[PDB]
Specification:
mainly beta, SH3 type barrels, 1 helix, 5 strands, 35% strand, globular, Mitogen-activated protein kinase kinase kinase 10
Length: 62
Protein backbone atom coordinates (compact mmCIF):
# COMPACT_ATOMS: atom_id res chain seq x y z
CA UNK A 1 0.00 0.00 0.00
CA UNK A 2 1.00 3.67 -0.61
CA UNK A 3 -0.94 6.91 -0.14
CA UNK A 4 -3.80 7.24 -2.62
CA UNK A 5 -4.74 10.62 -4.14
CA UNK A 6 -7.78 11.15 -6.41
CA UNK A 7 -7.51 13.02 -9.69
CA UNK A 8 -9.85 16.03 -9.62
CA UNK A 9 -9.12 17.12 -13.20
CA UNK A 10 -8.34 15.30 -16.42
CA UNK A 11 -4.71 15.43 -17.43
CA UNK A 12 -3.52 14.16 -20.84
CA UNK A 13 0.06 12.77 -20.99
CA UNK A 14 2.54 14.57 -23.27
CA UNK A 15 5.27 11.92 -23.00
CA UNK A 16 5.49 8.16 -22.58
CA UNK A 17 6.82 8.79 -19.09
CA UNK A 18 3.67 10.64 -18.03
CA UNK A 19 0.40 9.32 -16.69
CA UNK A 20 -2.90 10.23 -18.20
CA UNK A 21 -5.31 11.07 -15.45
CA UNK A 22 -9.05 11.13 -15.84
CA UNK A 23 -11.21 12.75 -13.19
CA UNK A 24 -11.77 10.31 -10.32
CA UNK A 25 -8.68 8.12 -11.07
CA UNK A 26 -7.07 6.79 -7.91
CA UNK A 27 -3.29 7.27 -7.86
CA UNK A 28 -0.89 5.66 -5.42
CA UNK A 29 1.92 8.21 -5.00
CA UNK A 30 5.25 6.33 -4.97
CA UNK A 31 7.31 9.52 -4.50
CA UNK A 32 6.88 13.24 -4.30
CA UNK A 33 10.55 13.69 -5.06
CA UNK A 34 11.44 15.77 -8.09
CA UNK A 35 14.72 13.82 -8.37
CA UNK A 36 12.56 10.86 -9.36
CA UNK A 37 9.92 12.70 -11.43
CA UNK A 38 12.34 15.07 -13.15
CA UNK A 39 10.32 18.22 -12.40
CA UNK A 40 9.29 20.18 -9.31
CA UNK A 41 5.56 19.69 -8.56
CA UNK A 42 5.43 16.47 -10.59
CA UNK A 43 5.03 13.27 -8.58
CA UNK A 44 5.43 9.57 -9.46
CA UNK A 45 2.31 7.51 -9.23
CA UNK A 46 0.84 4.13 -10.02
CA UNK A 47 -2.68 3.31 -11.24
CA UNK A 48 -4.84 0.30 -10.35
CA UNK A 49 -3.60 -0.84 -13.78
CA UNK A 50 -0.20 -1.12 -12.16
CA UNK A 51 0.94 1.44 -14.74
CA UNK A 52 3.53 3.76 -13.19
CA UNK A 53 4.37 7.29 -14.44
CA UNK A 54 4.87 10.97 -13.60
CA UNK A 55 2.06 13.48 -13.27
CA UNK A 56 1.34 17.04 -12.18
CA UNK A 57 0.46 17.17 -8.53
CA UNK A 58 -2.02 20.00 -8.97
CA UNK A 59 -4.40 17.48 -10.57
CA UNK A 60 -4.90 15.36 -7.46
CA UNK A 61 -6.62 15.90 -4.09
CA UNK A 62 -6.53 13.92 -0.82
Amino acid sequence: AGPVWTAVFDYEAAGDEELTLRRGDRVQVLSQDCAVSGDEGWWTGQLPSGRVGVFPSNYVAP
